[PDB]
Amino acid sequence: FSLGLQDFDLLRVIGRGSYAKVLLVRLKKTDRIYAMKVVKKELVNDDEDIDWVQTEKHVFEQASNHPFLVGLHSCFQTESRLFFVIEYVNGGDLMFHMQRQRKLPEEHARFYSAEISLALNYLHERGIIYRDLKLDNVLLDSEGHIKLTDYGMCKEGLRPGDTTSTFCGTPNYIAPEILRGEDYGFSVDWWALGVLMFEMMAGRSPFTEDYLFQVILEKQIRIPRSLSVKAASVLKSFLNKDPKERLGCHPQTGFADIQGHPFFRNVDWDMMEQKQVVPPFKPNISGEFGLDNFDSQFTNEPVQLTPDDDDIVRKIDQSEFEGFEYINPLL
Ligand SMILES: Nc1ncnc2c1ncn2[C@@H]1O[C@H](COP(=O)(O)OP(=O)(O)CP(=O)(O)O)[C@@H](O)[C@H]1O
Numbered sequence: 030f031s032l033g034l035q036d037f038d039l040l041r042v043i044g045r046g047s048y049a050k051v052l053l054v055r056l057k058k059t060d061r062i063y064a065m066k067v068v069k070k071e072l073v074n075d076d077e078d079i080d081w082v083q084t085e086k087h088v089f090e091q092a093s094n095h096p097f098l099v100g101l102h103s104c105f106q107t108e109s110r111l112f113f114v115i116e117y118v119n120g121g122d123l124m125f126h127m128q129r130q131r132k133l134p135e136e137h138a139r140f141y142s143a144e145i146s147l148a149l150n151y152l153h154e155r156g157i158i159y160r161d162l163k164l165d166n167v168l169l170d171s172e173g174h175i176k177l178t179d180y181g182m183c184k185e186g187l188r189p190g191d192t193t194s195t196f197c198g199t200p201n202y203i204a205p206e207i208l209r210g211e212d213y214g215f216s217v218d219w220w221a222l223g224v225l226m227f228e229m230m231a232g233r234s235p236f237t238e239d240y241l242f243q244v245i246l247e248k249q250i251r252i253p254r255s256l257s258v259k260a261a262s263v264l265k266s267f268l269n270k271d272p273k274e275r276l277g278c279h280p281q282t283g284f285a286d287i288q289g290h291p292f293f294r295n296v297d298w299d300m301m302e303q304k305q306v307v308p309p310f311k312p313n314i315s316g317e318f319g320l321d322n323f324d325s326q327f328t329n330e331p332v333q334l335t336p337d338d339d340d341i342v343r344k345i346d347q348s349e350f351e352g353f354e355y356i357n358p359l360l
Contacts, residue, residue: 031354032103034112037065042330043119043323048072048081048181052332053117053318062318063102066113067334070345073111079349081181082111086355088180089113091155093357096304097148099168099178104355109342110334111353118176120169120312121322123229127164130310132232135260135292137309141167142226143296144175146277149222150284152177153215156191158184162221163199164228171319173308187214200238205270208242215283216272223267223276230260235268246270263292 037054040062044051049066056063073082092098102114123141127133133141145167152159161182168176184193192212198204204220206213227235231253236244250268252261266276276290277283288298300306313321320328 031105031356032114033105034107037063037114039065039332039334040318041320041323041332042327043320044327046179049113050334051327053320054114062117063114064117066115068111068113070106070109070111070347070350071341073349084183084185085181086113086353087185088152088157088183089115090355091152091157091185092180093359095148095151096302097144097175097177098151099176099180100357101355102357104353106350106353108347109337109345111350116176118168118170118178119314119319119322120171120173122165122169123167123175123225124163124165125322126169126310127228127232133229134309135230135257136295138226138229138260139292139296140306140309141175141229142222143293143298143301145177145222145225146284146287147298147302148175148177149215149218152183153218153284156185156187158187158193158215159218159221160184160198162218162225163202164225167225169312169322171312171314172304173310173312174304190214200241201234201236203242203245204272205246206272208246213272216275216278219267219275219277219283219287220272223264226267227264230256230264235264259290259292259294263290266290 036057038057040053040055042050043053043064048068052065052067054063054065055061068082073079086104089101093100099118100116105112149159159177161179166177166179168178170176182197187193192214194212196207198207202221202224204213204217207217224235235250252264269275272278277287279286287293297306315321
C-alpha cells in the first residue's frame with residue numbers, strides 16, 4: 030500500500046541537521062525527484078522529540094499547496110528510521126546567499142521579506158507560530174522565490190488570540206517577550222523577520238547567550254546611516270521590544286499594517302502571492318539535478334544510509350511510531 034524506501038533511488042546527500050540526514054531521491058520508474066529527510070528513531074525518545082516530529086509532520090501537511098512553504102509527498106518508516114519525502118528546493122538559502130552577496134539592496138530585501146511575510150501570514154491564519162525564522166531556514170527555489178523550512182519548532186493549534194509559553198528559538202532571533210518569560214503569540218515571528226531584514230540590509234546582526242539576551246532586552250537598536258527612511262521605519266517597527274506596539278502585531282489590522290507600510294509600497298501583494306513578481310536574483314542551476322547550491326560537504330558524502338546496529342534497533346519502542354505513514358491526499 031504505502032510507499033517505502035524501496036520505491037526510491039538515492040541520488041545524493043544534500044544536507045544534515047540535528048535530527049535529519051537529507052537526500053535527493055527519485056521515485057522509481059519516474060523522473061519525479063524529491064528531498065527525503067531521514068530521522069533515526071533512536072533520536073526520538075523524549076516528549077520534546079515526539080512533539081518535534083509530530084509537529085513537523087502536521088505542519089508539512091498544512092504547507093502543501095502554499096507557494097512559499099515546502100510541500101509533503103509522503104511519510105513512511107523502516108525498522109530504524111522515519112522518512113519525510115518532500116518538495117526538492119535547490120536554489121540555496123538566504124544564509125548561503127548573504128555569504129556571497131554580503132549586503133542586499135533595499136529592493137531585494139523588500140522582495141524576500143514580502144514573500145516571507147505572506148508565508149508567515151498563511152501559517153498564522155492556520156493557527157501556527159513558526160518560531161524558527163532565520164537566514165538559513167529561508168530556502169530559495171530554483172527560480173529565486175523563498176520557501177520557509179524546518180517546521181519542528183512550530184506551535185500549532187492557536188485559535189485567534191491564543192498564546193503559548195515555550196522558551197525556544199535561535200538565540201540571535203528570539204523575541205524580547207520570550208526572553209521576559211511572557212506568554213506570546215504570532216508577534217515573535219514578526220520580531221524575527223525584523224532581525225532577518227536588518228541582516229539582509231545591513232550585512233550584520235543588529236546585536237555568550239546570556240550577554241546576547243541582555244543586548245536584545247536592553248540595548249537600543251541603531252539603524253545604519255545609509256538606509257532610507259522607509260527601511261529605518263520598517264526595521265524599528267518590527268524590532269519594537271513591546272509586542273503590543275510591534276508592526277504586524279496590532280489586533281485585527283496587523284497584516285494590513287505590514288502591507289500598507291511605506292517600505293512595501295511598491296509591492297503588488299496579490300501578484301507576489303501568485304509568484305508573478307520577478308525575483309531580484311536567479312540562483313545558479315546546472316546539470317540534471319541542479320546540485321549547485323548545496324555544500325560539497327554533503328554532496329561529497331557516499332550516497333547511502335548507515336547500516337543498522339541491531340543492538341540499538343531492537344530496543345526501539347515501535348509503538349511510538351504507529352500511524353506515521355502518510356500519502357498526500359492530492360496524489
Ligand atoms: N526541502 C528541501 N529541499 C532541499 N534541501 C533541503 C530541504 N529541506 C532541508 N534541506 C537541506 O537539509 C538541511 C538540514 O535540514 P533541516 O535543517 O530541516 O534538518 P533537521 O530536520 O535535523 C532540523 P535542524 O537543522 O534545525 O536541527 C538544510 O539545511 C537544507 O540544506
